[PDB]
Amino acid sequence: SRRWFHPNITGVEAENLLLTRGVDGSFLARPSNPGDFTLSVRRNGAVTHIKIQNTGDYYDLYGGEKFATLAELVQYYMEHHGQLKGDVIELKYPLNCADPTSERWFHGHLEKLLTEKGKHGSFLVRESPGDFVLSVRTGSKVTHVMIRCQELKYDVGGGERFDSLTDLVEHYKKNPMVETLGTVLQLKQPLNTTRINAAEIESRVRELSKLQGFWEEFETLQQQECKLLYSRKEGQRQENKNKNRYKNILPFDHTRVVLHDGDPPVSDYINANIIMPPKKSYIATQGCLQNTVNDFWRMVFQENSRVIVMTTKEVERGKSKCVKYWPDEYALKEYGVMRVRNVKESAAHDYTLRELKLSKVGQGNTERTVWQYHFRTWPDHGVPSDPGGVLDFLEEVHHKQESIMDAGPVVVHCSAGIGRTGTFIVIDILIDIIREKGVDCDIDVPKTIQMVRSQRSGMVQTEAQYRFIYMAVQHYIETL
Numbered sequence: 001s002r003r004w005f006h007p008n009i010t011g012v013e014a015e016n017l018l019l020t021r022g023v024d025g026s027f028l029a030r031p032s033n034p035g036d037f038t039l040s041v042r043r044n045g046a047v048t049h050i051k052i053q054n055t056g057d058y059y060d061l062y063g064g065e066k067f068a069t070l071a072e073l074v075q076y077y078m079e080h081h082g083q084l085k086g087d088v089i090e091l092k093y094p095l096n097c098a099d100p101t102s103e104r105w106f107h108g109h110l111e112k113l114l115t116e117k118g119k120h121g122s123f124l125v126r127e128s129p130g131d132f133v134l135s136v137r138t139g140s141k142v143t144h145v146m147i148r149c150q151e152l153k154y155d156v157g158g159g160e161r162f163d164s165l166t167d168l169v170e171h172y173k174k175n176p177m178v179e180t181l182g183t184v185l186q187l188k189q190p191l192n193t194t195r196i197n198a199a200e201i202e203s204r205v206r207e208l209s210k211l212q213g214f215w216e217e218f219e220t221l222q223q224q225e226c227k228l229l230y231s232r233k234e235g236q237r238q239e240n241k242n243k244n245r246y247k248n249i250l251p252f253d254h255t256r257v258v259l260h261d262g263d264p265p266v267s268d269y270i271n272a273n274i275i276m277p278p279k280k281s282y283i284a285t286q287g288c289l290q291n292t293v294n295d296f297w298r299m300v301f302q303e304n305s306r307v308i309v310m311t312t313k314e315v316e317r318g319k320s321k322c323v324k325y326w327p328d329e330y331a332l333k334e335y336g337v338m339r340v341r342n343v344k345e346s347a348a349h350d351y352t353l354r355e356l357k358l359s360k361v362g363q364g365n366t367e368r369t370v371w372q373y374h375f376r377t378w379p380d381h382g383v384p385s386d387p388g389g390v391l392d393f394l395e396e397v398h399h400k401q402e403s404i405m406d407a408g409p410v411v412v413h414c415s416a417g418i419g420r421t422g423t424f425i426v427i428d429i430l431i432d433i434i435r436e437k438g439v440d441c442d443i444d445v446p447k448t449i450q451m452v453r454s455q456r457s458g459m460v461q462t463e464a465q466y467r468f469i470y471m472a473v474q475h476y477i478e479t480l
């Protein structure tokens with residue numbers, strides 16, 4: 001669960017919540033300077049507030065580490081004590097949130113939708129006077145169940161009285177209400193309200209811009225991240241620790257890229273994952289370390305990747321984000337058993353193209369051209385104010401990829417390989433649907449993001465990137 005995340009509370013409410021309803025070791029996380037987060041922890045009778053920053057690359061915890069998601073952060077500290085400080089701060093008891101705002105099925109102030117979009121078991125919860133309504137489709141028909149709110153507790157007119165709409169929903173999801181004549185009121189899935197028809201994007205962007213709707217949709221997607229805590233065991237192995245740019249930002253074992261080139265001990269690891277929406281697949285990876293440059297070229301060669309998308313400068317804010325893993329123009333370099341020639345570099349406004357020739361040493365016939373698209377103008381923090389540059393760049397990448405027969409997955413990387421990486425990949429997936437199926441196609445942005453996030457942790461980091469994806473898709477349809 002992710003009940004420890006409270007979306008609409010202040011620092012004062014948080015302090016009072018932890019003092020009156022918590023104990024020592026009680027904790028909660030909350031949004032702020034908007035775009036930032038706070039981890040509020042009770043310790044020795046008093047509340048400590050810890051800053052969490054995210055400008056688009058990772059969740060940066062003060063006095064702690066950098067993480068892909070808030071759920072990964074909480075899971076880690078609840079399992080590794082003595083790590084948060086210089087007195088140790090323990091995350092023992094999540095203080096649960098009763099607010100239903102970030103639930104997929106909660107539609108506050110709101111049958112047309114269930115008739116049009118719904119299927120058997122599609123449900124929603126709306127506010128009635130102070131009471132709520134549970135509307136379910138079965139088949140086919142729609143049934144409305146009244147939810148009474150009496151002294152901070154919720155009930156369906158008998159039986160148990162719940163502390164939150166969530167507890168009631170979870171209960172009647174496991175134990176369905178049966179109508180007198182036998183209709184089982186199964187709460188299968190929440191009603192889909194995010195899937196839009198591509199041609200109606202401008203309309204959706206207008207409605208999400210109203211007091212904002214983009215924040216509520218993004219935070220509802222963030223609440224689903226607790227379902228994506230897959231094992232990242234291989235990246236924890238002693239011999240793999242120095243192969244990670246950020247020790248706690250790890251690739252899922254079920255999608256990680258396994259290297260078989262193998263110098264005959266532990267030669268099979270790279271912090272990278274296959275992303276499936278081979279030719280229209282991606283590899284989402286981190287910016288190279290000096291000790292992973294050889295592994296990066298073994299991955300590119302093994303996977304038959306012909307295109308690399310680099311979305312960071314080598315150095316940003318005086319910090320190394322990616323080592324230069326390619327030779328200077330006209331130069332030839334050996335990176336272990338791999339040989340790379342930089343044939344030619346071409347400078348465009350927002351990016352540089354580098355034509356590379358990759359081959360395995362001692363095997364001339366293994367040579368293939370690798371096109372490196374280096375996006376150089378992405379700001380240090382936040383996102384571009386206009387998506388035109390990113391779309392023009394992606395259009396170019398897409399055509400290069402399409403022109404190459406049996407090209408392997410597109411390699412995409414930034415610093416941690418989750419924020420800008422996930423943003424470019426999600427835009428590229430969404431735009432590809434519009435290429436294939438046309439302006440009259442269905443697109444579902446959080447659905448696409450959730451699908452990508454089950455393949456690599458925290459793909460798409462911020463609300464700013466989330467709004468950027470909608471803005472990019474809107475701009476691509478406007479130029480069609």
Ligand SMILES: COc1cccc(-c2nnc3n(Cc4ccccc4Cl)c(=O)c4ccccc4n23)c1O
Binds near residue numbers: 075229236247248249
């Ligand atoms: C079905 O799911 C799983 C099955 C097996 C292992 C994992 C697993 N993989 N990584 C972690 N890390 C993350 C982690 C660990 C050590 C060093 C750095 C990091 Cl960043 C935890 O802190 C953790 C804590 C509690 C439980 C599982 C955890 N876990 C998993 O999720």
Ligand SMILES: CC1(N)CCN(c2cnc(-c3cccc(Cl)c3Cl)c(N)n2)CC1
Binds near residue numbers: 100194222
């Ligand atoms: C008003 C409201 N409480 C906030 C917006 N809203 C929703 C609904 N569903 C998703 C969704 C869609 C597909 C996959 C995933 Cl994982 C998610 Cl979470 C979403 N992000 N927001 C409707 C309810």
